[PDB]
Symmetry: D6
Subunit: 163 residues, 12 copies
């Protein structure tokens, strides 16, 4: 139960670094290079909005920030100043990380396809649109799912270790 | 009344982080991707100005800065150097946060629609225009309203605790 | 006369923060989204230059920097090292802030209109041009005038307090 | 065996500096200046995605971050607090760097050509496309391969020195 | 001779701040908004290059950096460790600042006109071109000349004070 | 032999500052404002690549970083902890700086012309292309050559002083 | 009753000549120079079709041909070969010319306006369109109405003369 | 049975004149003003070809020429030179005119709609296209059907008169 | 009085030939090459219509046809079949030709200028437009006025000869 | 053998009329509406030239003119003025018409496809192009083949009748 | 003096045929393919009008018509009905043809250059423009001058023959 | 010598018909579909003028008209009214037709290539241009040469027959 802590800390820092340094620049051109075969004004806007409601990078930043709140609470408490608080914050972290992983699976799945079929007003009937960087975005998706799985496993390990 | 303080501090820091890190980049393309069905020069400018008089991110930055002024005053006083000042600053913070929440509701409501109908000069009669990222902007609106509600509840809690 | 100092310091810091964080990005697209109804090359340049000779944000940065010079002089003097210097620097600050407020009123007034009428070479006769974000720019103008008025009042207060 | 350590540290810092300061700006225009001889919408997207699945700079940042994890683990352990850990981390670093060099060779090779032949839907039959900055990108490839080879040699040196 | 030093330091810091914070963004669009009445490829490039050989902001940054070298030399000497060095560095600073002011006058003069007449290959005969932001650039020119004049006067003051 | 050290340090810092602050922004538009008289797709890419294989700013950053490696080695050695190392590092620095100056002369020469003649596929026969900011780039070239010459002279001075 | 015949023949020939020689070339550009303020494909087609269902020149050619049929019948009869036929053909000509004049008034009126307001699918709401050569077309309308009135009067004259 | 001949001759000449003088110029812009909402090359060609396989004016010219062949045969026979030939040619004319009227009904129907829905390669799925002058073309269709009906009735009249 | 008749006939035939052979092709591009400096849709149409209400060639064809009607009347009378008719038709021809010459002078004057100033809706304020072939059109105007003057003189000659 | 002559004359006149009146206007837009999916200048020209070397209408006019030469020769002979000439001209006409029918089959076949695949310089590899009015052109081809077959049969009939 | 008449008649008919059949189609694209290097609206119109005030074909048609008037006068006289009239008409024809040849030389000269230099408002300073078909137009000029010279010689021959 | 006359007349009429009916419409788009790979204004004009100085159809019309002049002279002579004139006109016709055939060979040769290489001002160095309908134009060239050869042979036949 000694190394588990060390590896959890290392995984957390690794995830933060990967998200902070490179992820902001794969998605930079997401809408400027999204294009549809049509002459109707506003169809690109409607179809992009329907294909990508919340961007991956926004979801990941939110998750990263929200999984660090129990630690901040514990730190503020101790600064004003314990084991019951430790138990409760561990429970809360476990719950939050399982919820976020499940939500990721339900929102995005495991792949980003290259074509999208759209039927939203003002587009006439169904139109075909084309995505930017699908392979790189799929690789990023899979990597993030793997890291979050590792973190879930480790936190369950420690929860069951204490009992 | 002990945990309330800790959670108020955590909510404040969380709100600042969310606004500072991601909000500047959802709104970056607000006017460059706003488009209207027309051939008249200046109609896009007039209709964008009428649809979005003050941007959300500007309003939120202003609110965040203004709700931290009583603390700065108290700090400057103590550095020159109390309970009466504490009472007064708590009262002022309560008033300011209720005012800002009410103003948010009256300025923006609870949703951002995808279409807008415009009848401002130099546009001839009424024209139809199309918005960028309405779903993401609606999600952001709802999240910010929820956070500000939490803060209002907590500050009223402490006000009534002291009495 | 005790609280006046504290509120002057708070107003100064508030003004600096508002100018530094948001003002650089309302004006970013000032000339790229300025457009005139014409086919003559160079008319957009001439009409933009005649409508907006010095930008608001440039004027405000200059004013903010210039109203902090007496403090720097006093600090450098004391570091080399007094009441006469205090008197003189208070007088100078008062004069500078009244001059800057008067100049603001004479340069810009109280509103930014949406249309502008231009008759400068190489434009043939008179042409009509269209401005970006007039409502937001008007709001910013009014807010800055109010803050500077508050500062003027406080400094006159202290000047007359000492006498 | 004394100088080997010093030169390994110098090589690592040199590599980090070269990657961090200049590499982000050779690749900035990679897709905006990629062009194909065609009139079909979406062909540029499909052909760019097939020619460049993962960008060099992304691969190099990932490798740089991943080769520094054993040191972070050792530091965290000692802070909580050894020779067995030293042995294991040396072994792991050796393995990781050999794996990354082999993967680089298998993904990219030793050159970036100026022409690319594409046959992916929606492109009709085979089309010809043109790359940006091939000579500079080839120079960067060769330099990075050389540096990583040096690092591999040094780490094997020390592994065999201890035995 | 006491206040002269203080005001010289204040003028130097003021000049550095003005150059560093705002000057980089008046000149940002210098070539993208330069336009000529012609259909010949390469004429805009040739005429811009002939009208503006070295940009003002480049000249000012170079001057600012070069007028601070004697101080760095004196500091490095004292750290290794005097009045003779003080004399020599004062002389050198005086000479450098007079040279730079004279060069500014000879390179640029006192105004930036709105029209420019060009006769360089590949332009056929003489063509007319149009400049961006001439009034703002003229204001900046005059302000910088005034500041440099103040600095020259003060340094001559101190030189003649010591003798 | 005392002042030589001081001036070498000052020259090195001056060179680093000049390269770091301004050079990144003269070359920013190098390819976006490069244009050729042709209707063939891909000719601009091929001709730009043949005219400018490695950019000046990349070469200068690499040289600056590489001429500081012996100092880092000496520092790391002393931290683990000498005159023999001093001798060797002086020799190495001399050699590296002479090599880099010779390479600069052989790669670029002393001027940047305004026209370039290109005959690379897919361009049909020979075409004429036009360069951005040739005068400013020539000035930068000459300045950098002068500085590097000064540094070479000083290092040879000290090498021969010790002997 | 003698001159009436002569003038009827002269009016008929005059009308035929005017229609045949010039009318085909006022209307030649009717749809190519019809333009609407819109970006919607197909709106110009729908609005032109609704504004001008049958062109004037088509209506006039049809009328001219149809008012000459009784004469052809009488000629064919006499060639095969009477007063009863004369009576009947006079009656028929009278009826046909009164019908055609009434239909002209009910289809077109007395003027062609320069603006037209359109609300047909696929146009969004109401749009404004602009007509070619309205003054010339109005002059032609009035002239043709006058000529047809003269012819009606003369034929009624002769009908009542015989009785 | 006397007038029937005269009216048949008059109807034939009237039909020829109407077709020859005006019909060539309603259809002149049939394909140049046919437009579809799409960005795919070749879709306009495929959809126009599927909507209008043989033009009305071509069909009518062919019919007019083919219904005059028996007369030419009879004339050539008599010039070389009968009642049996008269009978046979009357029979043939009757048959030909009934066949042509039936074919007209089966090819075109009674109206020309303003919209057409197309699903032919290379068009992606179904697209919407817009027709030129539908009301005028419908009027022409109905008029021609009426005239041909009159001719059919008259020829059957004479066939049954002889028996 | 003998040659006057011959020359009148020759002048009439000459005028008809000049109008019929060349005049239809100077005016062919009248509206396609008319251009105004503006970006407003419909302004070219409104300004062309206001500058040229009835084209010269239309006016001249109408005049030529109308001055030949008395001859046709006299011919038809004589075919049915005198000096009184001769007198009356001479009087009528004189009156018609004087009326047409006066109307020409009042409609068009003696020149066609190259510039036109327009202030009709939808044009904003006053705009400048440019005419096609003004010199050729002026030459044609003057020639036609001269010919019509000759004809007027001759007809008055004969009228006064008979008395 | 009596009717054969009459029907041959009727077929010849029918063919001439069909070719002369309508065929010139199906092919009018043959090259202006021919389009290929490419960005290479000159590819449309090369591919159109390879797909349609000699146009159908040119071939048919040439054939029609050449099959009437023996008659002109016989007429000129008789005007200067026989059975031997009749025999020879019949033989020649038979041969010419069989040759022309065979050549038609070998040049064009029985259909015009909608797509064409092109691989001629300057087109890169193989490109796809799209044809105008293929169904109408196929109908015309089949009709002309049928008529020419009828003529061949009749002329062989008469040749074998005389023997 | 016998053949001179015959050759004069043949030359006249030849000239009429050459002018009537081909000259109308060399000049058809005179203004549509005239182009100037400029971005100013109206400059093409002004420069074309100044370069070509009256077109060659207009001048030649006018001359051809005017040199046939004496014959028409003589014919009309004889129809009403001599040697004195013959003399006078010969004199007049001689004078007219010499005048027209001299005017041709003074208006046009002997060549049409490919470049033209223009300095008319609204063109800024002097601009360069490019002509269509200069070699063909020069050939036509020379041919017409030669023919008119032949005619002048022949008419002088006959004038001096009679005396 | 009897049939030779008949065949000469038939060949002449055949040639006139072929030239008059079809040749005017192969060359109609000669310059509108001529295109060069360049961005220089005026290069298309200069290169078209250098490639095609006099068009084939112009040359052929001129030749056809000029080879019929001796017949017109003989006809005019006989109308005023011989064997000597017959001899002379035969000689002249022979000479004219041989001259025209030789000139055709020297001006045009036997083929029209698809590419042309141009080096005329204002084109920079050498450019490549592309021709319209080369195969059809080559076929026309060869056919016309063959016909003119036949005519030459026949006229020499008759010349030598008389002797």
């Amino acid at each position: 139960t000694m190394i588990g802590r060390i590896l959890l800390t290392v995984v957390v820092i690794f995830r933060i670094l990967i998200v902070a340094i490179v992820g902001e620049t794969v998605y930079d051109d997401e809408q400027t290079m999204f294009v549809c075969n049509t002459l109707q004004p506003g169809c690109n806007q409607a179809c992009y909005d329907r294909a990508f409601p919340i961007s991956h990078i926004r979801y990941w930043v939110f998750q990263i920030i929200m999984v660090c709140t129990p630690s901040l609470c514990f730190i503020t408490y101790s600064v004003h100043q314990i084991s019951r608080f430790y138990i409760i914050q561990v429970v809360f972290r476990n719950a939050l990380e399982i919820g976020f992983l499940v939500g990721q699976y339900f929102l995005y799945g495991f792949s980003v396809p290259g074509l999208y079929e759209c039927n939203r007003y003002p587009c006439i009937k169904e139109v075909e649109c084309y995505v930017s960087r699908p392979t790189e975005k799929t690789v990023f998706l899979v990597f993030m799912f793997a890291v979050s799985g590792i973190c879930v496993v480790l936190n369950l390990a420690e929860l069951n270790h204490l009992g």
